[PDB]
Design a protein around this ligand. Sequence first.
Ligand SMILES: NC(=O)c1ccc[n+]([C@@H]2O[C@H](COP(=O)([O-])OP(=O)(O)OC[C@H]3O[C@@H](n4cnc5c(N)ncnc54)[C@H](OP(=O)(O)O)[C@@H]3O)[C@@H](O)[C@H]2O)c1
Ligand SMILES: NC(=O)c1ccc[n+]([C@@H]2O[C@H](COP(=O)([O-])OP(=O)(O)OC[C@H]3O[C@@H](n4cnc5c(N)ncnc54)[C@H](OP(=O)(O)O)[C@@H]3O)[C@@H](O)[C@H]2O)c1
Lengths: 285, 295
Amino acid sequence: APAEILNGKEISAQIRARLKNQVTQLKEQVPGFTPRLAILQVGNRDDSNLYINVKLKAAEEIGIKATHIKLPRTTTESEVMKYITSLNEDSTVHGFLVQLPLDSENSINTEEVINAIAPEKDVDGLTSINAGRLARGDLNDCFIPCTPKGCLELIKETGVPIAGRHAVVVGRSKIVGAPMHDLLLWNNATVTTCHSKTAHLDEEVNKGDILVVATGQPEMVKGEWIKPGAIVIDCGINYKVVGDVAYDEAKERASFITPVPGGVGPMTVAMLMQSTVESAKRFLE
Amino acid sequence: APAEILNGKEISAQIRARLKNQVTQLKEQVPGFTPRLAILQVGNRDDSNLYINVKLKAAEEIGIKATHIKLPRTTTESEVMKYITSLNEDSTVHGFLVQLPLDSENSINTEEVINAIAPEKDVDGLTSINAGRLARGDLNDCFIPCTPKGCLELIKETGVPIAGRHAVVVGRSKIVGAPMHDLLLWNNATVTTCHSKTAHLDEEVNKGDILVVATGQPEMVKGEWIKPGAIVIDCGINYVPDDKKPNGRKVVGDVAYDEAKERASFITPVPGGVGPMTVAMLMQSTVESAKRFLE
Ligand SMILES: NC(=O)c1ccc[n+]([C@@H]2O[C@H](COP(=O)([O-])OP(=O)(O)OC[C@H]3O[C@@H](n4cnc5c(N)ncnc54)[C@H](OP(=O)(O)O)[C@@H]3O)[C@@H](O)[C@H]2O)c1
Ligand SMILES: NC(=O)c1ccc[n+]([C@@H]2O[C@H](COP(=O)([O-])OP(=O)(O)OC[C@H]3O[C@@H](n4cnc5c(N)ncnc54)[C@H](OP(=O)(O)O)[C@@H]3O)[C@@H](O)[C@H]2O)c1
């Protein structure tokens, strides 16, 4: 009766073991070379502290050197810009990211901050340059955001070809929904994007052979809506922790489904690490 | 109950007359301010010369100063790059474009040339940075490529709100389909993008309250596929021989117009729909760049 469970915890563990061996091999080819990631944080949110620790731990396990810079809540845009410039110019840093959302007492234009990141170091793929390449099909020389990247990998774990499928993406954010659409489209799905102004959400969802949900609305996508045999990818982290999909009903209709926790979340961290290792390898050129 | 015809020739003429008045007024509000467009050409292709002259003439009618830089076929990539850098840095120039395709005896990386354009001057909207802003919903200050821009304008001429409609885009090219998707999405349509690998294209098309077709496949989208009451926007320019026409050839769209006009509530003809919009949209983007520069 139930959907096969796409176990992101196990899959991510296989990815991290491969990345580790790749990193060990780079270091034996070029001794003293150390791939390096930096994470710049503004403020002191509890959830951001937890996510960053998970990232630092994965990095150290793979043999990536990881630096965490934590700026106070008094930080201004102009101070964040100086750090980004410093990370851009530090040739020991192969990739870096800015943890979102920024936690400051001052107004900081997030887009302007992100877009000061040098594109070759933008391992989160959130610069307009990288978004622009992805959105137009040029996946050759481009970092892709870590969440959609992990989702695509989960979709591929089913062995079902994406080409020609009707995919539905619920959500259109910069971090998840919009790039998710792009990845599905340039893997030759026919893609429908939904958002908060979509009418008859249920009827749109029901057309998805592939369904990716990234709304942050706890369990709003009902199992009833899911197309029989669909692949269901659920990005939601909502406070127990639950997804954006009503799992117990959706599991009876899908052929493949991601649980929450242990689905998309661990896969996201593995892809960040993969992008980091890519940046380090490109720099060795 | 046949479709109202969206007359692109008339609408574009209204747009160009309003832009003129706006430009006259900017110059009176800030005397000495001169909106300025540059077009950089490489080589001497006949078709490019024709298109450029049309753009220069529209600009001069509106009161935009238009400069044409024409480099010879002997030009190298590094010389093209130097001109782009110079246009980027010339504070009198608010917008410029590079006419494509380049006509040189040397290898010139087109993508690299285009992507040296400063985003704030990229009136054709084809730089990666500008594509990226548009694709992620920064519609306040990015540039929009001229064809999808004109499509959106035609859709708005109907007075039917876009928000909550199911829009279908057939095609995903850099120049039309992809930016078209972005405009519809950030106007709050629910958007489906189809392409050459879409299965059951007819059934996908039939879900479109708004349909934009940009395939280059003459009359492939049949009237039977059109949802009743749909807005149909047809970007196709396909040449077919026809001895009964003044110049021995007709232009048809990517939509089978005669059958689609019986099903749509609004439809663009070909010729005379999307095509005449395009030069006016370039002019509109140029006026936007000049206004943003004016702070
Ligand atoms: N595992 C990870 O590392 C990770 C990373 C990022 C995100 N996520 C999770 O994924 C979820 C989404 O995050 P985000 O950054 O993409 O969030 P976000 O920026 O809040 O965007 C939510 C999106 O869902 C849409 N939406 C909201 N209510 C909806 C409704 N009733 N019907 C349809 N669409 C609706 C929004 O519509 P509008 O655009 O119209 O506002 C928007 O596009 C969250 O639970 C987040 O915690 C996880
Ligand atoms: N000023 C003007 O009037 C103007 C300006 C621009 C464009 N246009 C016209 O608009 C049309 C499209 O031009 P473009 O620049 O977008 O061309 P293009 O680069 O060739 O793009 C064609 C697009 O349509 C898709 N397509 C092709 N055959 C299809 C089929 N059988 N079923 C579904 N989708 C199919 C292609 O799919 P894949 O992506 O899968 O290959 C692609 O995304 C042309 O007639 C062009 O002349 C007019």
